[PDB]
Design a protein around this ligand. Structure first.
Ligand SMILES: *C(=O)c1ncc(Br)cc1OCc1ccc(Cl)c([N+](=O)[O-])c1
Ligand SMILES: *C(=O)c1ncc(Br)cc1OCc1ccc(Cl)c([N+](=O)[O-])c1
Lengths: 299, 298
């Protein structure tokens, strides 16, 4: 019973968090095998306005990089820049390296973030890659290098590394190969208009029904008619593959996807009239259909 | 920037999670030093759950009736302390962190590492409600999962025991004493009237102001007494002077007096926009939680 925004257990990622210092800049890094991954902007405030990163790295040597893993000091024997991440080769392989992969997720997918400062964990929480490729996280100065991940049974899938806090107050970063999610690269950078992850909202309504919350159940509708309503309310268009992913939840609940779409159409056109769903007064869109299944089945 | 419901990093607790089996009942256990702690109802059959005589049931079981799984342990002793089983094992957990057993107060927060068959499944932050229930996510098989705070030292405060028909959850401290009026028996058990943790709501309003959301801020004032008259009507817990003292540091950081924040809350209750992306008033961040997240304590 119950339904919570649930993060993956973070023990496997905690063992890979180290502290990287260049000059006076200190941030977090990720230590897997004999390589430490960290944001490349670790290399001044004057540089923050228009850095020629290739030119700034040139002036750097291996001993200019201080990688600390708890109390032990790692010696850097090589450095290279891949897109927007630094890769520092160290003389020791991380003995706590889990089975891992680097994955680039799609907008709408969820992951857990282990927020870190000075290489030490401070907290873990679940969030989602918004359609405009930002995330609404909790990141203070010093959190850069914190990574987002999914755990697919024993294997850690690193998908995010924190790089920046936009003036909007939302956050942007890269995958573990250094490619920013979205158009982001210290200048004014506008994120796109954010929209609601429709397939996630529908999955969350399935979670509600499973947990006894059914007052919003109604009508039917077509994929097209619902999408016309979804476009008006800044909702992502619902495709047939979204309907297929919602299959298992439809079978378990006995509620056809297009029937749930009609209930959501009503919820969008009429609002919630002060009622709550799973203790929320808003429509929640940061649970994937896989998230709902995992929590309700207990994987 | 930002404010999230944030759980403690769970690595230290993961290393203490084992799987405990007695007969056909399997649930989670906590392995610290040479002792495995688990709910004592692991020894009950389904017929026993309606009126178990735990002493009579434990008497008929021996050490070898307990199969303790630590990933892929021999039990050399068993004892019953209130509602928890204490299984002495021949091996001390090499991953035992520095730990303490603590009994928290209503309104305090902790992280829950939800587990099934001794394997972690997820971590989330919740609060001990005033009626001593928690609004968690617990399926059958989750019993033995523990709630904790981290101060290098892990403070274990909760062990899950039962899912009420209400859909809320109840458990004990690590000494076996239930939070609330609940017993480990399958009968209808009523939780109290739940109330809103007023001091937590005020802390969350400070987090909002810290993060740029200030529209709810007024110029009115109030006394502790007048505010409590309003709070009583809306099923809010009464705010004492100790609660005003706890909110001191947040007042200093924001420059907003505690009683001024209480006056702003008077509006929100009497008149009902979003605050930190929420359309409801959140009461599961303590003032210590807000400081920890906004100052970045690792
Ligand atoms: C960010 O995590 C961080 N921590 C510590 C220090 Br010192 C500097 C940090 O990055 C600041 C920052 C903010 C915004 C942008 Cl866009 C950049 N950047 O040029 O990448 C850096
Ligand atoms: C609970 O975590 C659990 N998991 C697996 C099995 Br098999 C049995 C479990 O406990 C069921 C349960 C439910 C409610 C109550 Cl009140 C009790 N109890 O008598 O303590 C047990």
């Amino acid at each position: 019973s119950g339904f919570r925004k649930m993060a993956f257990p973070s023990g496997k990622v905690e063992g890979c968090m180290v502290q990287v210092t260049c000059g006076t800049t200190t941030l977090n890094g990720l230590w897997l095998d004999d390589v430490v991954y960290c944001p490349r902007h670790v290399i001044t405030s004057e540089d923050m306005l228009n850095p020629n990163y290739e030119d700034l790295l040139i002036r750097k040597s291996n001993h200019n990089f201080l990688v600390q893993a708890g109390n032990v000091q790692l010696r850097v024997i090589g450095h290279s820049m891949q897109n927007c991440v630094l890769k520092l080769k160290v003389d020791t392989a991380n003995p706590k390296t889990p089975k891992y992969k680097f994955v680039r997720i799609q907008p709408g997918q969820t992951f857990s973030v282990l927020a870190c400062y000075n290489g030490s964990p401070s907290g873990v929480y679940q969030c989602a890659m918004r359609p405009n490729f930002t995330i609404k996280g909790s990141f203070l100065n010093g959190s850069c290098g914190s990574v987002g991940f999914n755990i697919d049974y024993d294997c850690v899938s690193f998908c995010y590394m924190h790089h920046m806090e936009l003036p909007t107050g939302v956050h942007a970063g890269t995958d573990l190969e250094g490619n920013f999610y979205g158009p982001f690269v210290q200048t004014a950078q506008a994120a796109g208009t954010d929209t609601t992850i429709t397939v996630n909202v529908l999955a969350w309504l399935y979670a509600a029904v499973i947990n006894g919350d059914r007052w919003f159940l109604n009508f039917t509708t077509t994929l097209n008619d619902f999408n016309l309503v979804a476009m008006k309310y800044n909702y992502e268009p619902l495709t047939q593959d979204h309907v297929d992913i919602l299959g298992p939840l439809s079978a378990q609940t006995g509620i056809a996807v297009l029937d749930m779409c009609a209930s959501l159409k009503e919820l969008l056109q009429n609002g919630m009239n002060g009622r709550t769903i799973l203790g929320s007064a808003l429509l929640e869109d940061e649970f994937t259909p896989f998230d709902v299944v995992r929590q309700c089945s207990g994987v």
